[PDB]
Symmetry: C3
Subunit: 218 residues, 3 copies
Amino acid sequence: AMKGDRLKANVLAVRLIPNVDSDMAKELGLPNEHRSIGILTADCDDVTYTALDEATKKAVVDVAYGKSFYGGAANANTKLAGEVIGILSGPTPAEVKSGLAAAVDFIENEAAFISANDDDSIAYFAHCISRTGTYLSKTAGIPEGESLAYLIAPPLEAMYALDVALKAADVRLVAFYGPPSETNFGGGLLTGSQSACKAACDAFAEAVKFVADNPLNY
Amino acid sequence: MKGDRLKANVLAVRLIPNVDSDMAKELGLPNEHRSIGILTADCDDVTYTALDEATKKAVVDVAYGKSFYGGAANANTKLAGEVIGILSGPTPAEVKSGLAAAVDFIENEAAFISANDDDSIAYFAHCISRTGTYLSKTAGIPEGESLAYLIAPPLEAMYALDVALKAADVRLVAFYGPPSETNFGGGLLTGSQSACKAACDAFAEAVKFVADNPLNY
Amino acid sequence: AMKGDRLKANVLAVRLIPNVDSDMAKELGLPNEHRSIGILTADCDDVTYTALDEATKKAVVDVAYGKSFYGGAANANTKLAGEVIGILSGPTPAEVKSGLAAAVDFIENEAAFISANDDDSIAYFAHCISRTGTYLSKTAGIPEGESLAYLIAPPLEAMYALDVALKAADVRLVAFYGPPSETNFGGGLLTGSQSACKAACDAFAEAVKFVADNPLNY
Ligand SMILES: [Ca+2]
Ligand SMILES: [Ca+2]
Ligand code: NA
Ligand code: NA
């Protein structure tokens, strides 16, 4: 991948369970009447979280579980692990299947990290969500449907660029991901009007590239 | 090769006959225990099962047991592997007996099994007939009760744990939502010895079914 | 690198932010009076923590943030991550710049892990801090200016060697780093007179090498 190239995310495995065991439902703390779950793993965590949020907009599902794996996909130690697992729950298998379809389609086509340099060794996520579903709005502590700038980069780049993004528009920090995340990245979620979120995304991206270009000159 | 047992290895072992009082306090050792035995190995859940086995074979308690980030494939030093365990006991003789029991068990008595041809997916489905004092405490069940110790990579584990719970009269007593430090998942199930064995068989079969077709849902 | 060789640490990236956004100042927990921060990443965490502490000595700065990355530098998944991020805060850019200069100088010249074998596959830190600054004194729960033995090694080596060090001199355990740290090491901080801390370091170093030579002879 060259500088500015999109890095495609991949779904590695998916399973639908029409009627989950009650011990499992208890451990996952599933909502009332949610007897079906859908599980997926993928090789890119933040793309997947955005995808799970998208699924809540497209189907009658809730995000029951979403966690990132230590060291990220480059350090995966089994074939189907990737760097993230997501679980959707819903009242029927048909709705969960629909939620999975939405999530898988999003992961593979709709959001991607971007390479910040020529040897594909620095990458960032700067994704503008026009209207949040139920998952990222809950995460951010904001009303469902608000806009979000989802900004992620490696540790130093993230901290520097997040500050630049906060200065670029009328936005507010609503979730802070101090590095390291499990994948050794950092960043945060910003909210504001859709256009302010987009301005923040653009500024974040430019800032990360600036650091990649000149890491030691301060 | 699929179905092959993946042997675990002990990397380092060291006995401390009389540990410093500051260390004793940090490890939470009983007043009566000033001998400890330390070991590292390249497989964490095999090691936890072994530490529990040691409590049945010697006058020892498990003082410490933690898994390392990324698992053994990502170890960044020679003797780290992916787990450290510490046994404590009233005398060096008893701790040595416990260490011997743990080392023998790790090297011979339990193993992950490969679920595919490339050895890139593996699972643990071990039936403990009679728990010692360590895994019983972890599971919140009486010492001596049986367990199915079921571990696999994240999606496989969640899917197969569900299948295992449906396969026999068993109950979930410890839930290991992925990722563990080694990026696996699973759980401990309890029930009669035969039920735990049935759960193990069903778990193993389900992990293999996912490995065979990961994207068919 | 051969047995006994010092393993030089490197600073990977540095940024100075003269007036950080107030949202981020809150998330980082800075004092109302500190809006300048200096961020750095490096490839060795314990050397960096020692450096950050040293940096508080000649400049008007506090260590605001210091975290290690999962798996250590050998498992880094991007170019500028290394295995640690540190943030200094202070009241003005001039003071933070001074703190950064001290930290960078220290990381690259004044402290290092040492190789314990000929493979360069086992290494330890046994650094005697003559006078702590405000960061590691606080970490250890001791007064600023007290001496420390900063002792780190891989998991089993560390536990065995820490015990030997505790027996080697009149020192007291003031911070216990039970393995794994995020980088899968272990160890602790010991305090006593400077001469006692130095004796503890020598003992710890010898003990780690002993284990490396005799890992299974127990
Ligand atoms: Ca729909
Ligand atoms: Ca690796
Ligand atoms: Na799409
Ligand atoms: Na589209």
